Curated annotation (Swiss-Prot):
Role of this protein: Part of the ABC transporter complex GsiABCD involved in glutathione import. Binds glutathione.
Domain notes: Glutathione binding may promote conformational change, from inactive to active form.
PANTHER family: GLUTATHIONE-BINDING PROTEIN GSIB, PERIPLASMIC BINDING COMPONENT OF ABC TRANSPORTER
Species name: Escherichia coli (strain K12)
Official protein name in the record: Glutathione-binding protein GsiB
Key word Manganese present: no
GO molecular function: peptide transmembrane transporter activity
UniProt GO cellular component terms: ATP-binding cassette (ABC) transporter complex, substrate-binding subunit-containing; membrane; outer membrane-bounded periplasmic space
Keywords on record: Periplasm, Signal, Transport
Classification via PROSITE patterns: SBP_BACTERIAL_5
Localization per record: Periplasm
Coiled-coil segments on the chain, per record: none
Length: 487
């Protein structure tokens, strides 16, 4: 019997060459034909994939990876230390100007000691490197295919995965078919997968209804109830890695005063916000890092208390609040309801905030491309996904004093001697204990200094036919379908 499943996704794909994509979706789909040395499961946990095992010098500089022998690429060629070298050399060559260059520029060189042994030496220590190797961007592509297609490799992928490219209709869909020579006997179980972009949200959910699609994501809030009521459809609300928050320019107006920051955090009723802006598909944030990320810490939740808040602003010296600005990035999602709710809650405590949604231009001009002594940024509503699955990318770009704009995304212009050093120390050790310890310390300082108003952490809403099993949504919004099957 023919097992042909259709997945209804959210947008169009950019490229099928992982190294050249900034959107998770395209990377997730390209996972049909590509595998990495390592990868993360649906709980965001480390797994050895094409790699058998690995070792790292106490110097943190040298990584020695053992590979599984006998694996073939979809074009008949062999997967070996040389192919890994070719994939890594290419990714770390700036001349290639591949969108994900920054994830490999720290690689000094890759050596093929033997067909099943790869020696990678970094320029500088970076304990999160193993995570970079498990990232869906680091795909092992066919050296032969890299040469045959050159710069068009992103259209005609050739990897070691369970599916081969059947055909791609730029706007219509990406259809992949079962690869007979897949290195794992018995897989895949499916004969084909058809990834179909469906921009209309209501239509996406509707297809699960008619049976037109067996899996879909994301699912609109209104359509959620409908689907969950259907016995042929399984609707899930899973944890994501999207942190929602409002940063405060800790070097400005009343925000320099830590009492104000502590105050404004009492002003927001988070459980109410999750209902009003996310339809209950999120949770109040009890940390600055989504708990699904490795090394994250969680704390006792912020109570909601307008009285405590107004009192604190008074002690601070603002018996009648004050006025400030609240910027958010222009979008069509839930942001709109978040702003209206927030400035309303802030109004209750006397904080007149002038909301403003900015397009790509103003955002890059007023928020990202601007330094402290110029920036107008005061209160900023935004979000962030640590797509590496570990604390560093969830913490450095947002709190490391060196990452203030236009360098990186520390919109709160926060800084702290200990945190910066704790973050730096973390990257120079590979001992889990030390790492959980170092990161835990930085987070405790951050949470207590409150440079933010951590709002919530979203929930991913997906749904699939009861018949489709082994098909999962990952916190980073990618898919895990190693053992997918149909009955
Ligand atoms: Zn490019
Ligand atoms: Zn050749
Ligand atoms: Zn040649
Ligand atoms: Zn076909
Ligand atoms: Zn065909
Ligand atoms: Zn249709
Ligand atoms: Zn399920
Ligand atoms: Zn109180
Ligand atoms: Zn728009
Ligand atoms: Zn199921």
């Amino acid at each position: 019997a023919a097992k042909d499943v259709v997945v209804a996704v959210g947008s169009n794909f950019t490229t099928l060459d992982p190294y050249d994509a900034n959107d998770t979706l395209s990377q997730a789909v390209a996972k049909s034909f590509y595998q990495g040395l390592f990868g993360l499961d649906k709980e965001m946990k480390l797994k050895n994939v094409l790699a058998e095992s690995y070792t790292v010098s106490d110097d943190g500089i040298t990584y020695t990876v053992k590979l599984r022998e006998g694996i073939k690429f979809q074009d008949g060629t062999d997967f070996n230390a040389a192919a890994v070298k070719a994939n890594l050399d290419r990714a770390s060559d700036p001349a290639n100007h591949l969108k994900r260059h920054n994830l490999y520029k720290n690689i000094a060189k890759t050596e093929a000691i033997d067909p099943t042994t790869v020696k990678i030496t970094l320029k500088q220590p970076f304990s999160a490197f193993i995570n970079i190797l498990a990232h869906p961007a680091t795909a092992m592509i066919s050296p032969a295919a890299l040469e045959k297609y050159g710069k068009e490799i992103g259209f005609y992928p050739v990897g070691t995965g369970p599916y081969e490219l059947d055909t791609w209709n730029q706007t219509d869909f990406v259809k992949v078919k079962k690869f007979a020579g897949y290195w794992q006997p018995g897989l895949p179980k499916l004969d084909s997968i058809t990834w179909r972009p469906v921009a209309d949200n209501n239509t996406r959910a509707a297809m699960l209804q008619t049976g037109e699609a067996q899996f879909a994501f994301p699912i609109p809030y209104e359509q959620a109830t409908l689907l969950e009521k259907n016995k042929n459809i399984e609707l899930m609300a899973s944890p994501s890695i999207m942190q929602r928050y409002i940063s405060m320019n800790v070097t400005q107006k009343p925000f320099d005063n830590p009492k104000v920051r502590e105050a404004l955090n009492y002003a927001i009723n988070r459980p109410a916000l999750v209902k009003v802006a996310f339809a209950g598909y999120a949770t109040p944030a009890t940390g600055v890092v989504p708990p699904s990320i490795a090394y994250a810490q969680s704390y006792k939740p912020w109570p909601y208390d307008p009285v405590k808040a107004r009192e604190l602003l008074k002690e601070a010296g603002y018996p009648n609040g004050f006025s400030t600005t609240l910027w958010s990035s222009h979008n069509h999602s839930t942001a709109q309801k978040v702003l209206q709710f927030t400035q309303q809650q802030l109004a209750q405590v006397g904080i007149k905030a002038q909301v403003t949604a900015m397009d790509a231009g103003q955002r890059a001009a007023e928020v990202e491309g601007k330094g402290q002594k110029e920036s107008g940024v005061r209160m900023f509503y935004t979000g962030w996904s640590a797509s590496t699955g570990e604390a560093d990318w969830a913490l450095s770009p947002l709190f490391a004093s060196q990452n203030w704009p236009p360098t990186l995304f520390n919109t709160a212009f926060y800084s702290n001697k200990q945190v910066d050093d704790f973050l730096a120390q973390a990257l120079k050790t590979n001992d889990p204990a030390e790492k959980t310890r170092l990161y835990k310390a930085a987070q405790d300082i951050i949470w207590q200094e409150s440079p933010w108003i951590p709002l919530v952490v979203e929930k991913l809403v997906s749904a699939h036919s009861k018949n489709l099993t082994g098909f999962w949504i990952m916190p980073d919004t990618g898919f895990s379908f190693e053992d997918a099957d149909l009955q």
